[PDB]
């Protein structure tokens, strides 16, 4: 009930942040792009799989900066 609403709000934010971030990376804004991806990672309960996926899809120096941000 409220549990569904809680989960809905997180799932919307998660996908919206990843999609905003992806678009900023396409636009060559890595700075703001990574900031949004770190918002998606923040709401991720168990992020290790997500981080391994990001590591496959990002240049390593960018993955590395992302880690330094969390």
């Amino acid at each position: 009930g409220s549990d569904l609403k809680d989960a809905e709000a997180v799932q919307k934010f998660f996908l919206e942040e990843i999609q905003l971030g992806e678009e900023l990376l396409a636009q060559g804004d890595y700075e703001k792009g990574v900031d949004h991806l770190t918002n998606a990672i923040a709401v991720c309960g168990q992020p290790q799989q997500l981080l391994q996926v990001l590591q496959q899809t990002l240049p390593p120096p960018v993955f590395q900066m992302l880690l330094t941000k969390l």
Partner: peptide, 15 residues
Amino acid sequence: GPRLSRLLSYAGSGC
């Protein structure tokens, strides 16, 4: 909400 694309992406993330 719920939307399939949010459900799928979240399931795909393993989060």
